[PDB]
Amino acid sequence: SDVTVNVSAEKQVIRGFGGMNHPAWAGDLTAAQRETAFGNGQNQLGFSILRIHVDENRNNWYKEVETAKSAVKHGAIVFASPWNPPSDMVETFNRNGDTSAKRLKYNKYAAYAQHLNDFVTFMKNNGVNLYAISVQNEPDYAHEWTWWTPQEILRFMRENAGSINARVIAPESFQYLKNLSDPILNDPQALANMDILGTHLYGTQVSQFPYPLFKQKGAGKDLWMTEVYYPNSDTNSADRWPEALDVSQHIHNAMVEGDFQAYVWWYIRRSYGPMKEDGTISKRGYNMAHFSKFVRPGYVRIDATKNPNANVYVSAYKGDNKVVIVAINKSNTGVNQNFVLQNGSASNVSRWITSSSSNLQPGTNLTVSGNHFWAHLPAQSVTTFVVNRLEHHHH
């Protein structure tokens, strides 16, 4: 019942939260949008990770710059994800009685790597140092891009990933299918060439969110959730309540059962995304803000009773002499929840609340009496708490 938050029990170090931009596919973000996405002011998402795509055709690369730049100016990091290598690098092969399936040609592996590097360079030349670049987007769901089998990816990791002058994301499975990435963890050599394990969660059940292999072999390595939308992509859904609570608990789980350090959503602007086509922040977006604006890059998740009451779900982070808590209630019934702070101390507590008729609405300040506080989590809401740790280290 009691949520106890162990300030001492550090888990993963967060890199950020964010969305995808794709100007050719969804139209660029606009100046104003750019900063609804990356500003952290009132009514901005404070996204601190932008994802952009590496376009097979290098004379489109420039499409990416203005928005990257914005992100980079706001202190967000940016990584890039290739869908297809340059068309002349690709052969049609037979995937289960499928005359049509495409793949990188076995002997373009180094050309492909150059192409990646070129992109990383081009961005650099336009004032944008990519944080990371991915080998392939959903290589295991390539019906309409480039297929790569686990062993194909394994070689590129072994023989090519090493070249790329940027951190290397792989292998971006559409659904976190571990067959596509074990080959890498289990190969101390491919493992050397990897910097971030990256996946999507499309249709991945909570039970598949954990990954012992990685926990075993991936020390020094990053875990990112580089793509999902959830719970659906129903055109014009981004304001449904209580539906959008789901986006919230989804991230909850990403963070907690998954130890993902980053959570990247699909299109940022989109009738079904965090920011609606009118420029405006959606309920889904609000569910996203509750993390993205308070759990700043470099914060660290910590142990905290995750599921203290029916439909109540909880996660905690620390940074900046703060502990940020995220408490989600999914009953039609508001609940009094008590919070214990173990191995740390707090002066005071601030909070914001998204419900059916409220987004990121400032709530009532609280003072930490014992080493605990109580707070009511309204029916179908997500509350986020910023606790202020005590000071005498002159800060």
Curated annotation (Swiss-Prot):
Q: How is activity modulated by pH?
A: Optimum pH is 6.
Q: What class of enzyme is it?
A: hydrolase
Q: How does activity depend on temperature?
A: Optimum temperature is 65 degrees Celsius. Half the activity is retained for 25 hours at 40 degrees Celsius and for 5 hours at 50 degrees Celsius.
Kindly tell me the pathway this chain contributes to: Glycan degradation; xylan degradation
Assigned keywords, A-Z: Carbohydrate metabolism, Glycosidase, Hydrolase, Polysaccharide degradation, Secreted, Signal, Xylan degradation
What chemistry does it catalyse, as a reaction equation?
Endohydrolysis of (1->4)-beta-D-xylosyl links in some glucuronoarabinoxylans
Q: Which GO terms describe its cellular component?
A: extracellular region; membrane
Triggers of expression: Constitutively expressed.
Q: Which GO terms describe its biological process?
A: sphingolipid metabolic process; xylan catabolic process
**Which SUPFAM superfamilies has this protein been placed in?**
(Trans)glycosidases, Glycosyl hydrolase domain
Under Gene Ontology molecular function, one entry of this record is: glucuronoarabinoxylan endo-1,4-beta-xylanase activity
Q: What positions constitute the catalytic site? A: 138 (proton donor), 227 (nucleophile)
- Coiled-coil residues are none
- Tell me the superkingdom of the source: Bacteria
Q: What is its EC number?
A: 3.2.1.136
Q: Where does the record say this protein resides?
A: Secreted
What is the annotated role of this protein in its UniProt record?
A: Catalyzes the depolymerization of methylglucuronoxylan (MeGAXn) from different sources. It cleaves the beta-1,4-xylosidic bond penultimate to that linking carbon one of the xylose residue substituted with alpha-1,2-linked 4-O-methyl-D-glucuronate (MeGA).
Q: Family assignment?
A: Belongs to the glycosyl hydrolase 30 family.
Name of the protein in its database record: Glucuronoxylanase XynC
Q: Provide the species name.
A: Bacillus subtilis (strain 168)
